[PDB]
A paper describes a structure:
Mitochondrial energy conversion requires an electron transport chain (ETC) that generates a proton motive force across the inner mitochondrial membrane to drive the essential adenosine triphosphate (ATP) formation by F1Fo-ATP synthase. The ETC consists of four multisubunit membrane complexes: complex I (CI; NADH:ubiquinone (UQ) oxidoreductase), complex II (CII; succinate:UQ oxidoreductase), complex III (CIII; cytochrome bc1) and complex IV (CIV; cytochrome c oxidase). We purified the intact respiratory supercomplex from mitochondria of the ciliate protist Tetrahymena thermophila and determined its structure by single-particle cryo-electron microscopy (cryo-EM).
We found that two of those subunits, previously annotated as ciliate-specific Ymf67 and Ymf68 (also known as COX3) represent complementary protein fragments, with coding genes split in the mitochondrial genome by a tRNATrp gene insertion. In particular, COX3b forms a contact with a peripheral amphipathic helix of NDUCA1, which is part of a zinc-free γ-carbonic anhydrase (γ-CA) heterotrimer. Another CI–CIV contact at the same site involves COXTT2 with a N-terminal globin-like domain that interacts with NDUFA3 and was not resolved in the individual CIV2 structure, suggesting that it becomes ordered to mediate supercomplex formation.
Residue numbers in the entry:
A (entry chain EU): 3 to 90
B (entry chain Dg): 1 to 52
C (entry chain ED): 65 to 127
D (entry chain Eo): 63 to 124
E (entry chain Er): 2 to 105
F (entry chain Dk): 2 to 21
G (entry chain Df): 9 to 58
H (entry chain EG): 2 to 99
Write the structure that this text describes.
């Protein structure tokens, strides 16, 4: 493992190739977030998972989302805000 | 290349020399496409030597 | 490794016996593949406008 | 501004060492070079005695 | 040959002004072009103009053998059509004329 | 002429000074 | 802060470094790993050329 | 220590948009669940199709219904946030330019 | 420099025929890893200084000619031998052995040529301590010198 | 083509030769240079430096640049005036001069 | 031989075929131009080889003579078309010569 | 006779000369960087000079 | 239903979309107007090759789809396996895509000549911009100090159109008038950046000692993308195309 | 038929890459500091000391990154279920089965990873003691956030540009 080496900054490591050819056909599905339908599907699935977690939160060590918190609501709501596939 | 660009190929053949060598002229391309590689590579080496 | 193992298992099962009811998921996948092949043939031999008109009429009739 | 170039004029020494005294002397606006750059490439007119007297009477600006 | 442009047309209005100032057979046009190049980006600055004049002095000194004080004691700095770059004074005058003609 | 030499060895760099 | 006369030649200054410590100038220059080879090549070339 | 202060007008507009968007998101999630249930019920009762196809159609119908319900607040918040981000970026660039 | 190149190539051939011990193999592995990381698998044009860019590209081109092209040639020879064998066996033209056998030959012959010429590639990257590439090269050289109990340029 | 070339050669070299045949009291040098400019500045032996890279390699190009600057340093040279400037970089690749006009001497290109 | 500095520039042998020396820039340019002169003859050489082969093979009375019924020539601009190659030769010669001059 | 030998002989000869004779380099020289370069064969001996 | 009608009948839907979308997105991201334009130009140049390759492949398939059927004479696999024909068509499309990508993104180094710069004969502008960006890009690995933050806050009203008239009030500035004037001139009039001050640099080093001990260089100056990106190429001393420009660069 | 297919899109809806000034405007002081620190740590770790980088990376791997990878792997295995999808005793269609698996499994992995992020990232940001303590320690500002945003976008651009030539790239 040794995460320290990865954390270490290096000119060559920073300017080297991080994404190879094999990853593109395996990760091109992430561009579907452009579609409002896909965004809605993902939001519905996330909300359902949050509801399940809240219902099962009675067990120790598991805490569901609290609607009072601003950070949780903001992060859940603005995840797909301003999404643009053209800009890297 | 050459006569094919003209819509009057008979005129193309007549107006230059009134002679027909098209068969050889068009069969020479295949040989010319590879006869030059050794000279080209040796010239690249010689140009690099001159640059050094 | 997984592909080789699964191909071996499928070949062994097919060689041994084939008169066993399969899972609904696999059956539906095969049905969908056959339907997709037929739809490809229909699209190849039919016009997009005709397909769209037929689908719209069928949807209106269903409603 | 893009096409502006020095064209080799007044290309005196540019110190690179941090502690070189030139790096401060040239920064000092009130610094007088031994001779103006245009005159640095022109023939001398004063006699040897006159040049020696001028150099002896020369005083550093500081 | 010693200018900053492959051909005189690449240079701006300063080259045309130099051509007008000097006769077609007078090689002072090259010195005027050198003055134009020196004045590029400096005429519009009070210090830049003085720097361009000093550059002209240095250029004349490097082109021809010269003594100290000759360029300062030049009587007339004006240039006429038939002035040739045969002396440091003439070279300096042509370079100054080019700097003056330089606009930007 | 245009490409009479047919190639230029731009890779060959100016040899770097190595004196101490 | 500077003494306000930085760069002035001290009166009677002599251009002698007989007892100067050169260890303080080590960090001001860089020598490549082949410094000895370069020195020998320089000596050989100078002897055989000059 | 002092820190960059955002425009109060933009802050208030974003607060209103965010409140509306949260309320929408919740109601639209419920509407999407209901639409998925209704689409599944219709498909399994009147439509001759495979279970996988029916479930996919129901999921897409529910997602489309939720998006239709929540588009207004989502679009309003998106435009307001884009304008606010542009203004903040321009101000910070003007401050830090050197 | 043709004489120098011939001498270096012959020295590398003689060393390869001689063989390597544990320390020499460790040093060669370090050199090969450094070369692969900083030259072969890195775009030389992304370096800071023009001088280091040019020298890194010179080292990369020398590595290409002395390793990649040579391995391609040897793998092509092996694949052509296999192609002749299969053509004789089947009494017909076959196209499968060319790509697969050529790739296998290249994979087999790249390590041996890289080991043969590892020191030359490592030395050609000695731009100088004033640059990042030269500093990393010097660090690896110090490590190799410590391993080998000797001093090298 | 030959006739046009010969006509140009005549206009530049033959007819002007007869304009001056005796010492001139006023502007003798000016008139002599006027008649000599048309003949000594013909583009045939002046043009070409603009495309010098066709024959000059980068290092050779820099060496020939410095050589040409030294050769044409003389201010009194209409041929130098009409010649293309040497103060430029090789179009393919430059190894010596990084920027044009950034020198340590107004004459030497380095 | 100026000391250990060998100033001799020509080391040609009894059967030298090239230039006496190649240290001079002029001679280097001439040698490069001469070497690249012969590089631009591939198509012409191949065409002439094919012409010679065909003439030696089929143009004899024994194999395949052809009835030449043409009375008079009708070419008008074939000379212009063919003289492009000597035009290129002249352009290259002028370029190299002027660059050296 | 006509094409392949004429277009490959000189290059083959130069390649072999570089291989087996160091392109006629005179050794005992110092600092190759400062030393002049002994060019490979460049004059076509097979072509009529 | 009113919002749905608005969405359907918005005139922006009929209005053709422009290229300003990338600039607006980059401005929202944080890039300045000029930086946004440069980055948008770079991205558009990178993607134009792929778009053109896709269009070319589609057009080739549309015009010459019968070539796949004709090839069945030599490759009956196409005739007896439609899947093979589909894979061949996809491979042809990808081939056109890759050709376009090579044309518009590959280095394809060429000479810096005004006579042909910008003709796309060589990808010189894109290559130089990419190389400069990748070489000179180094994220600011610091935390903006209190002095830098205060100077940024104080730079609200600064403008180069007219110099501010600085007035010394002893009761709110302290120190002496001359020292205050010198400090103000250094901070604002001189244009010196806050991180270039000696005490600011010393504080940065003291605060980032841990990074220095680890061996990481501290970048005093934040990266300025507009100082390395120039679609026109004037920054990199690339000669503009002669026929589209009325001026020349020395080089 | 546009960028969303061949360009990089997996970094835009994860690791707080979508955080901008709009969230900070409504956030309180502590929430703003936490959000800014999270964005900086995820996008530009260079601003943090090595110890902080290691600690934050460990926490992120424990909570969001590796958890989402595991969930995506589980979904991908669910997709793998039933392999080979179409086959018989005569032919097995290995190429078709491989194509179907390669098309289906990564999509399920993406769905699972996006679900995990959407569910847990807000909770991780809001209720992580390590993130709270580190945000309090560093106390980043809006200027720092803007610089980090620009640097993250430039890093994404550099990553896209570097992979331009994955097959052939001499260099000169
Ligand atoms: C059983 C299966 C098992 C499978 C197992 C294996 C599985 C393996 C894993 C597989 C995983 C797959 C995962 C991904 C799958 C899903 C992907 C996905 O989400 O994709 C769906 C994707 C999701 O859509 P979205 O991006 O979320 O929608 C955005 C919203 O609408 C938001 O839009 P907006 O509001 O911001 O603005 C647009 C506005 C609408 O405002 C407008 O009018 C916009 C007009 C734009 C300009 C149009 C120009 C037309 C002229 C020609 C083109 C000119 C050039 C410029 C074009 C620019 C681009 C438009 O939209 C509305 O508000 C409409 C109301 C919404 C409800 C109605 C929905 C209707 C359908 C959507 C499209 C409607 C278009 C209407 C156009 C106008 C008609 C009068 O849907 C589409 O791509 C659109 C629908 C399909 C279109 C097909 C067209 C085919 C070609 C037709 C050619 C012939 C006609 C050409 C002219 C047009 C007709 C006249
Ligand atoms: C002593 C002995 C040794 C020697 C010692 C040394 C002696 C030194 C002596 C020095 C003497 C100095 C003077 C030398 C010159 C003397 C000349 C003389 O006396 O004879 C007069 C002689 C008389 O003329 P000629 O040479 O007989 O004229 C015949 C033509 O040259 C021939 O052309 P043509 O058009 O008449 O016929 C050919 C044409 C006729 O054929 C046709 O029907 C044209 C067909 C065009 C379309 C092809 C593609 C179709 C595809 C269909 C679909 C397929 C299925 C689907 C597959 C899809 C997927 C694969 O087809 C072609 O081959 C042209 C194809 C185009 C090439 C470029 C294509 C690039 C793209 C690739 C396309 C094809 C491949 C891809 C396929 C698909 C891939 C997806 O030459 C002259 O007139 C004067 C020559 C002066 C020199 C300059 C001339 C410049 C003008 C152009 C001509 C250049 C060539 C000829 C030069 C001469 C030498 C060869
Ligand atoms: C998409 C963007 C759009 C933007 C907006 C545009 C808006 C419209 C504006 C349009 C304005 C017009 C622009 C035109 C530009 C043209 C190119 C240009 O600027 O070149 C100038 C060119 C500068 O090129 P350079 O000197 O080589 O400098 C390097 C370049 O700067 C740069 O070099 P490099 O570093 O890139 O590469 C180095 C080297 C590397 O490359 C090579 O080595 C390549 C070598 C082979 C040549 C290229 C491939 C050829 C393939 C075979 C032919 C085609 C095959 C397919 C078709 C079948 C053909 C049979 O390349 C060269 O050697 C270049 C030599 C020039 C020729 C090759 C250039 C490509 C030609 C493409 C032609 C097809 C496209 C359409 C036509 C052209 C565009 C309108 O200037 C000259 O050379 C002219 C000097 C003239 C001196 C005075 C001459 C006096 C007359 C003496 C002879 C009299 C003869 C009388 C005969 C009478 C007989 C009776
Ligand atoms: C019918 C179409 C007409 C087209 C218009 C052009 C042709 C006009 C009639 C022929 C005369 C052309 C003279 C051009 C040059 C005039 C100026 C001059 O001599 O000096 C410039 C140059 C000399 O330049 P220079 O070196 O003296 O430069 C002067 C400037 N300084 C001193 C600063 C350097 O002339 C030459 O170099 C002449 C070389 C000989 C060949 C000239 C060929 C010209 C082009 C081909 C013409 C073909 C005509 C065919 C007609 C019949 C068929 C249609
Ligand atoms: C229509 C008529 C047109 C005529 C056009 C004019 C033609 C002029 C050229 C004629 C060439 C004739 C052939 C010469 C072959 C010379 C081979 C040689 O020594 O190598 C040179 C070249 C010289 O290269 P090198 O490496 O040996 O030495 C170079 C010189 N040093 C080392 C000093 C730098 O070598 C090769 O080409 C090597 C491969 C040769 C392979 C072919 C060998 C053929 C042997 C002769 C033929 C077979 C014997 C029986 C023939 C029976 C005939 C009936
Ligand atoms: C691309 O390839 C090409 C080239 O590249 C190599 C070219 O260079 C070229 C250019 C080449 C040319 C233009 C041609 C150059 C010339 C060539 C090839 C010919 C050279 C020929 C020779 C050197 C041989 C000379 C011939 C001879 C007969 C010489 C004598 C030899 C022999 C064995 C006979 C000796 C006999 C005697 C001296 C006489 C004794 C007998 C008697 C007196 C008779 C007594 C009588 C009785 C009855 C007894 C071309 C065309 C080319 O295509
Ligand atoms: C993603 C993984 C899952 C598997 C999918 C893999 C996709 C790989 C990449 C794309 C492959 C494209 C090729 C697909 C198979 C072949 C399609 C085809 O038939 O194309 C040829 C066809 C010719 O037309 P034809 O119907 O024969 O008319 C004859 C008239 N006498 O002409 C056509 O019909 C045109 C075909 C165009 C193909 C795309 C070209 C790129 C640009 C597309 C722009 C947008 C087109 C929108 C079309 C909407 C249609 C409703
Ligand atoms: C692939 C199809 C093969 C067809 C063979 C039969 C026809 C022969 C006639 C000539 C055909 C030439 C086809 C050239 C296609 C080039 C495609 C291309 O440019 O692909 C991209 C590739 C590298 O690009 P990449 O790093 O992957 O990423 C994109 C870069 N922005 O770009 C490059 O590699 C850079 C450009 C290289 C161009 C080379 C052209 C000449 C190749 C001659 C090879 C001869 C030997 C081949 C084997 C025997 C064939 C009989
Ligand atoms: C109009 C609708 C369609 C519009 C889009 C058309 C796109 C045409 C280009 C090929 C598309 C292949 C399928 C979709 C892939 C999506 C992801 C993608 O394209 O990834 C990028 C990569 C090519 O990019 P590259 O330029 O090489 O990398 C540069 C990195 N800086 O991608 C690849 O390398 C993947 C393709 C490699 C070549 C494959 C050729 C044969 C086809 C195989 C398809 C996959 C197998 C499907 C099998 C089951 C379904 C039939």
């Amino acid at each position: 493992s040794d995460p320290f080496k990865k954390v270490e900054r290096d000119y060559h490591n920073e300017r080297s190739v991080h994404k190879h050819f094999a990853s593109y056909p395996l990760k091109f599905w992430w561009g579907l977030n452009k579609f409002e339908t896909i965004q809605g599907i993902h939001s519905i699935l996330g909300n359902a998972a949050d509801l399940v977690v809240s219902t099962l939160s009675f067990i120790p060590g598991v805490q569901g989302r609290n609607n009072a918190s601003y950070i949780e609501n903001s992060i859940r709501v603005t995840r797909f805000r301003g999404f643009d596939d053209k800009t890297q | 290349m050459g006569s094919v660009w003209f819509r009057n190929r008979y005129w193309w053949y007549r107006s230059l020399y009134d002679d027909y060598v098209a068969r050889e002229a068009k069969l020479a391309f295949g040989i010319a496409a590879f006869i030059w590689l050794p000279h080209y590579y040796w010239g690249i080496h010689l140009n690099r030597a001159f640059e050094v | 490794f997984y592909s080789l193992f699964n191909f071996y298992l499928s070949r062994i099962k097919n060689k041994n016996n084939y008169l066993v009811r399969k899972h609904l998921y696999t059956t539906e996948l095969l049905i969908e593949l056959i339907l997709f092949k037929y739809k490809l043939i229909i699209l190849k031999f039919s016009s997009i406008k005709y397909i769209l008109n037929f689908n719209v009429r069928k949807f209106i009739l269903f409603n | 501004a893009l096409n502006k170039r020095n064209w080799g004029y007044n290309a005196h020494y540019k110190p690179e060492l941090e502690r070189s005294m030139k790096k401060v002397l040239y920064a000092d606006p009130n610094y007088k070079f031994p001779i103006e750059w245009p005159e640095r490439y022109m023939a001398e007119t004063k006699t040897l005695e006159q040049v020696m007297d001028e150099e002896e009477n020369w005083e550093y600006y500081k | 040959a010693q200018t900053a442009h492959q051909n005189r047309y690449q240079g701006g209005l300063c080259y045309a002004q130099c051509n007008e100032l000097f006769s077609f057979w007078n090689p002072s046009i090259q010195q005027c072009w050198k003055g134009c190049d020196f004045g590029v980006g400096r005429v519009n600055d009070p210090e830049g103009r003085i720097e361009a004049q000093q550059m002209c002095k240095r250029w004349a000194a490097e082109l021809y053998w010269t003594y100290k004080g000759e360029l300062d004691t030049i009587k007339d700095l004006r240039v006429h059509a038939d002035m040739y770059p045969t002396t440091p004074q003439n070279v300096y005058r042509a370079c100054l004329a080019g700097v003056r003609r330089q606009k930007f | 002429a245009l490409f009479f030499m047919a190639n230029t060895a731009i890779s060959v760099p100016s040899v770097l000074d190595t004196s101490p | 802060d500077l003494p306000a006369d930085y760069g002035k030649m001290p009166a009677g200054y002599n251009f002698l470094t007989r007892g100067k410590d050169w260890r303080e100038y080590d960090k001001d220059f860089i020598l490549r790993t082949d410094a000895v080879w370069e020195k020998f090549q320089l000596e050989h070339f100078f002897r055989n050329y000059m | 220590a002092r820190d960059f202060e955002y425009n109060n007008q933009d802050v208030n507009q974003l607060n209103g948009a965010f409140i509306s968007l949260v309320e929408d998101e919740k109601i639209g999630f419920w509407v999407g669940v209901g639409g998925f249930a209704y689409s599944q019920f219709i498909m399994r009762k009147f439509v001759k199709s495979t279970n996988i196809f029916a479930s996919v159609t129901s999921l897409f119908a529910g997602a489309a219904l939720a998006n239709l319900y929540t588009h207004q607040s989502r679009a309003s918040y998106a435009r307001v946030a884009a304008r606010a981000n542009r203004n903040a970026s321009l101000a910070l660039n003007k401050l830090m330019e050197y | 420099s043709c004489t120098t190149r011939r001498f270096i190539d012959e020295k590398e051939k003689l060393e390869y025929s001689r063989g390597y011990n544990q320390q020499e193999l460790e040093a060669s592995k370090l050199r090969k890893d450094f070369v692969k990381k900083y030259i072969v698998d890195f775009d030389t044009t992304l370096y800071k200084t023009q001088v280091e860019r040019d020298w890194a590209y010179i080292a990369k081109r020398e590595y290409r000619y002395e390793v990649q092209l040579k391995s391609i040639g040897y793998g092509g020879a092996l694949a052509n031998a296999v192609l002749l064998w299969r053509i004789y066996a089947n009494k017909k033209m076959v196209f499968w052995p060319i790509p697969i056998v050529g790739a296998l030959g290249y994979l087999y012959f790249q390590p041996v040529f890289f080991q043969k010429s590892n020191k030359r590639f490592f030395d050609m990257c000695n731009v100088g301590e004033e640059y990042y590439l030269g500093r990393e090269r010097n660090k690896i050289l110090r490590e190799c010198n410590k391993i080998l109990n000797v001093e090298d340029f | 083509v030959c006739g046009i070339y010969v006509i140009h050669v005549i206009y530049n070299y033959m007819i002007p030769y007869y304009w001056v045949s005796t010492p001139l009291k006023n502007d003798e040098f000016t008139r002599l240079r006027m008649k000599d400019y048309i003949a000594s500045t013909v583009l045939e032996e002046v043009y070409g430096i603009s495309y010098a890279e066709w024959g000059w390699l980068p290092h050779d190009f820099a060496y020939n640049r410095m050589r040409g600057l030294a050769g044409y340093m003389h201010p009194d040279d209409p041929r130098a005036m009409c010649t293309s400037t040497f103060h430029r970089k090789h179009k393919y690749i430059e190894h010596e001069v990084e920027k044009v006009g950034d020198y340590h001497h107004m004459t030497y290109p380095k | 031989m100026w000391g250990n500095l060998w100033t001799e520039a020509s080391y040609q042998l009894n059967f030298n075929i090239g230039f006496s020396s190649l240290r001079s820039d002029v001679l280097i340019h001439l040698a490069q131009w001469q070497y690249w002169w012969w590089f631009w003859f591939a198509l012409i050489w191949s065409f002439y080889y094919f012409i010679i082969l065909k003439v030696a093979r089929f143009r004899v009375l024994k194999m395949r003579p052809k009835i030449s019924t043409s009375y008079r020539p009708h070419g008008k601009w074939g000379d212009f078309l063919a003289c492009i190659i000597p035009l290129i030769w002249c352009i290259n010669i002028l370029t190299n010569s002027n660059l050296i001059l | 006779i006509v094409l392949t030998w004429g277009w490959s002989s000189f290059q083959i000869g130069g390649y072999n000369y570089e291989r087996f004779d160091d392109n006629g380099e005179r050794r005992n020289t110092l600092y190759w960087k400062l030393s002049p370069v002994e060019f490979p064969q460049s004059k076509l001996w097979n072509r009529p000079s | 239903v009113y919002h749905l009608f608005e969405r359907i009948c918005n005139p922006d839907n009929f209005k053709l979309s422009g290229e300003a979308a990338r600039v607006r997105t980059l401005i929202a991201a944080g890039f300045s107007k000029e930086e946004a334009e440069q980055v948008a130009w770079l991205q558009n140049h990178q993607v134009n090759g792929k778009i053109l390759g896709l269009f070319t492949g589609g057009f080739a398939l549309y015009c010459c789809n019968n070539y796949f059927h004709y090839f069945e004479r030599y490759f009956p696999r196409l005739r007896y396996q439609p899947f093979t024909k589909f894979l061949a068509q996809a491979a042809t499309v990808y081939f056109f895509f890759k050709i376009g990508d090579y044309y518009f993104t590959s280095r394809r180094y060429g000479s810096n000549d005004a006579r042909m710069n910008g003709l796309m004969y060589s990808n010189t502008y894109y290559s130089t911009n990419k190389e400069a960006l990748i070489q000179n890009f180094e994220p600011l690995n610091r935390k903006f100090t209190e002095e830098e933050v205060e100077q940024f806050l104080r730079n609200e009203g600064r403008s180069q159109e007219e110099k501010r008239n600085w007035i010394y009030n002893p009761h709110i500035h302290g120190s002496t008038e001359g020292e205050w004037k010198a400090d103000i001139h250094e901070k604002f009039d001189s244009g010196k950046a806050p991180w270039e001050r000696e005490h600011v640099k010393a504080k940065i080093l003291e605060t980032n000692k841990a990074k220095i001990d680890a061996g990481e260089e501290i970048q005093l100056k934040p990266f300025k993308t507009l100082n390395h990106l120039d679609k026109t190429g004037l920054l990199h001393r690339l000669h503009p195309f002669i026929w589209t420009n009325n001026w020349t660069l020395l080089g | 038929v546009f960028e969303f297919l061949f360009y990089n899109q997996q970094h835009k809806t994860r690791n707080g890459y979508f955080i901008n000034h709009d969230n900070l405007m409504l956030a309180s002081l502590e929430e703003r500091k936490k959000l800014i620190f999270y964005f900086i740590a995820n996008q530009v770790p260079e601003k943090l000391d090595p110890v902080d980088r290691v600690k934050f990376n460990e926490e992120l791997s424990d909570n969001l990154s590796t958890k989402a990878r595991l969930i995506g792997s589980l979904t991908g295995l669910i997709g793998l279920v039933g392999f080979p999808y179409i086959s018989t005793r005569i032919y097995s269609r290995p190429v078709l089965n491989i194509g179907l698996s390669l098309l289906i499994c990564p999509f399920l992995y993406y769905v699972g990873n996006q679900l995990t992020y959407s569910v847990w990232e807000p909770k991780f940001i809001a209720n992580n003691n390590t993130v709270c303590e580190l945000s309090k320690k560093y106390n980043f500002t809006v200027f720092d956030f803007a610089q980090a945003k620009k640097e993250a976008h430039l890093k994404a651009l550099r990553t896209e540009l570097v992979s331009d030539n994955l097959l052939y790239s001499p260099g000169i």
